[PDB]
Amino acid sequence: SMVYMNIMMAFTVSLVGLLMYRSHLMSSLLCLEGMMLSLFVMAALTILNSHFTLASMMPIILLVFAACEAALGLSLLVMVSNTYGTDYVQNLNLLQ
Amino acid sequence: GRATFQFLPDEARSLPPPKLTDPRLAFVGFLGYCSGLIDNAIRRRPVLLAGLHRQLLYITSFVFVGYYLLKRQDYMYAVRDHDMFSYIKSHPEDFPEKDKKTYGEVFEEFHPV
Amino acid sequence: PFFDVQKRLGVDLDRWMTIQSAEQPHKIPSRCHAFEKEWIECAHGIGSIRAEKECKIEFEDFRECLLRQKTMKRLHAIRRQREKLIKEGKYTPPPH
Amino acid sequence: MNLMLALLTNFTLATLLVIIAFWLPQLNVYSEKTSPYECGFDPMGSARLPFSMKFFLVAITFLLFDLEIALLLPLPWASQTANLNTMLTMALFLIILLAVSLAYEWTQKGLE
Amino acid sequence: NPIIFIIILLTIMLGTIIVMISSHWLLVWIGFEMNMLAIIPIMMKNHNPRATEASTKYFLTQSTASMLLMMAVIINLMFSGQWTVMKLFNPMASMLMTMALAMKLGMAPFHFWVPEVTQGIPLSSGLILLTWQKLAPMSVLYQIFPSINLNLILTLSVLSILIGGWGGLNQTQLRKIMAYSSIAHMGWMTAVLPYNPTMTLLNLIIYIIMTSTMFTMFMANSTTTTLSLSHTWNKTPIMTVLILATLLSMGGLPPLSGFMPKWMIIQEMTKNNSIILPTFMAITALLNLYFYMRLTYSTTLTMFPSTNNMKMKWQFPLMKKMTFLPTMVVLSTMMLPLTPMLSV
């Protein structure tokens, strides 16, 4: 019913100017690691309100990578700001 | 077709098979026979005929493989046809028998210069 | 290209979680379960390209078992047969 | 319906008690000089917090051992089944998939 | 170190084998979710301040690319509630599939990326592995194949083979020139795709070979165009007849095999009585050729041998299977009306 239009307007959290930008990359990477819960919850209802009884594990597997992988891509964000000290998306150097 | 993820099924028994001395199988590995001669020439062999143990084992490979592959190709064009006639045969309503008319009949255009 | 190995040899990779009615370990059903074994029965020997213009009946209600999309509208339209006339008579019900 | 009655009860004693401690004498009429004498016993301290790595990994290093002990969590519900061998043979895999993931990294912790 | 590099480099194809083998929407997530997990360290190996400002412009551009998909999987879990892999039962699914999946392949838009990564990965060794990621997605599009809005997958195509064409004429670095004109050949194979989707793969294999045999040749030291001038008077001239026996064949001319995909593809795209589409593709791959000419006027024109440069040593690279391919990248046209009935 209504709970399917919220949360959906929430899953436009993408909003992409705020997905790569502006600086403090950690804000961009943040709205990514919370782009989940729009994928999770939304898929923790349709599975639940009707009894699938089987795909019920799927919600668990939507995290176990969403944490595993998104925690990888954090790593690079040390390598960027190790050599700098400010992330600041404004580093372009490799060009085209 | 059926018996999926099979290189070829059992039904290919009824095909000739494509035995040797066809120009392709000869040609297959010819393009390898001009491949072997390369294989030397890249490294400054500089033989242009070097050890026959590299200058062979190619020709052995291609024509075997070229052969073992042509066995199914010819198959496929058979199962293509076979599934056509057997459909063309039924539904004769979709397949008319045209009449026979010589020229006491047809006019063309008729536009000479 | 879809090889479908699990058809040739014996293993089951997935094929179990796939649809709304398969097992459900203790044998407990879904809500719209009974319409699956109805709708799959329709298109099987079909090649699915005529399915869309053939069955379509056993499918639609199945889409309307799932979301309850219509019955909720004919319902919301009792709130207009009553509850505009509340003052105009037939309170409806008598309590109890 | 009585859980939220047992939560917002708890905070509202706590979110009360900040003001009746922090705030109440905070407007008292005593001196409270604005002098920059505060931030005890490292008087000035002008720097960025530098990246110090072996501080960092002990974050990551955990986060991954964490996941699967969510995967590992539904053992005691799964001890009630039909065919159980697919459990013991399978259950014991995760663990050894955890313990392996140690032994590798265990060549280098550094100073942890 | 050296063992694992074969554990990683094996897990990739295991990432893409669960893609082609599966029945089940979840697995085609996990399937190419663990590439963006298992690709990343290969970029690194020499730990430089590009690869690390590269794979981070790659990462978050294949992060959402995936993470939209999972939103267009769970739409038709609502409607019809049957996973598996077949037409998507609802238009907001597909339009959110195909034009958010074009991110991994990148098509007509969604490429400010393919030149920003392929350029300046310090590792040119390969970078042949960016021929896998062409091969994971297609092995969805072949299945979903009878659902597309059909006004799109052409509209990303025809805006592609154009936009990847013009992209390079202005380029010098020859890692880019392959980066460009690798959007191009993504214009032919997904322009076909609704009509008779095999005779796509045909263009897919003939592509994996030709771009493959380039790099293995570009590996000795070769980097910048004007380091391919110092080539013939230095390294070996039998190299130059090679780089002229392909770069020409790759845009294609009928006695070679590079002409083999077009020649067959248009048998298909007419006979469906669309004859005003293919000319414009057929005619636009033309000025896709003027990279290669003018690339090939670098090496046969004896241009100012580098300097006093004396390489008296022989070679010890791995040419592995280069001594084959440009006898199959060239001479195969005379052979085959197989490719339409062989893989089918």
Next chain:
Amino acid sequence: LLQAEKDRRVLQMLRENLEEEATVMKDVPGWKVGESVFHTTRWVTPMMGELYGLRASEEVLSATYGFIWYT
């Protein structure tokens, strides 16, 4: 035994939520009495909105949310 008590409780429940509906109004642009939102015909367990109408006061709130959040 326990079940043979329930099935009677809903069939009693539909009738009153119908017989006390069809007597609300009979409208010319109205609905036929007890039509089916489906084409197919058999007994399909009804949705909460079927049993309890727009009634929506309390004993509903103790039905749907009754079990969850507490004894």
Next chain:
Amino acid sequence: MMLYIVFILSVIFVMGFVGFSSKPSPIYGGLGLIVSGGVGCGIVLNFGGSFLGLMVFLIYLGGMMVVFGYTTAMATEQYPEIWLSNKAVLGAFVTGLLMEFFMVYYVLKDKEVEVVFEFNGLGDWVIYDTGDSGFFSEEAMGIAALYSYGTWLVIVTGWSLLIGVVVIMEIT
């Protein structure tokens, strides 16, 4: 404590996001999440799914975020001013907040307006349950433990994690 106690959570949730979906100086980014995550794990605890809700606290909100917060001392931002800092964040906010509000206003402020927002009725939680039932651990995600049928689902996830560390033992 009405029937609307679900609809009142989500529209706090939907407002949980737009805090950090613009540009807040990301030491307040967390405080846009642990509210959103919290209310998120709130909504799920209705509907009967419970175990699967109470995990998001354990595996993500509790466990994950702290790493997201244990850094941003390593990437540590400058003490310029933060939050209300630069005069720009505020401009982008409201137009989002009103956009559901003005949506939520006349979405249904009346009988119906109009069609696309009119096929969602409200207030009894029409669908939110069905009938009665028996019990298995509950009925639903009470049985979320399959080391039976699920195997090729685990053994990829089981194996895909084991490589998670090797990649990260290097670039580090």
Next chain:
Amino acid sequence: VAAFLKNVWAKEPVLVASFAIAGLAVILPTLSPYTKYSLMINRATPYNYPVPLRDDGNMPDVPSHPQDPQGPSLEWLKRL
């Protein structure tokens, strides 16, 4: 090699107590015959409701009255 196994137990006698328990829990489930009792008990617990089948002719066993002689022996547990 036993001199090794006593010369790691003069230095790290810790993980050795983990390996010592690492195996010895893997090995034994394939030994003691108490197991496979464990699989019989766990199959017989009626989570669900038994539904009576239709009897025309056979009807191999299991009469209308349950306590009459019907089917297998589960009472080897009651004495256990």
Next chain:
Amino acid sequence: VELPSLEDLKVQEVKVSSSVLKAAAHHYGAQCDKPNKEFMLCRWEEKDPRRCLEEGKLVNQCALEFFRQIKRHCAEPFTEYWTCIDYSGLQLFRRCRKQQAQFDECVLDKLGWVRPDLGDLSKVTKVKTDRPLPENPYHSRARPEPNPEVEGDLKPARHGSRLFFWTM
């Protein structure tokens, strides 16, 4: 849709708490089994618990005389028995174990019942076929018709691949 009237309703429901209802509850079903297993088969075998109301009044009936039976002979040990089990939480059966004999002293003895320990509610039983075993399953509209097959013979290709020229 067709629903029965308001009638054959308002029947006599057994009105007792949920503590007493589990007090005997045990001698109850093992010894009866006259309608009830059969009444399942008027549901599981054919669904739509509307077409089958009839045995519902038979199975509801069996209970009536049961609790009406027990009130005549001994309600005194029963009344005291379901008090302890009604002393509460979880309604365990292992607290009242002592008094279990006092209730069952003469019930199994005087009016001649038995303790159906583990054999009740197991040993999947049978009933009988009285009502027509229904065909015309639940919904069950139409087939529809499949594809005629193709086998015939296998020729080789006719003239050899017929591509553009490409003889063979």
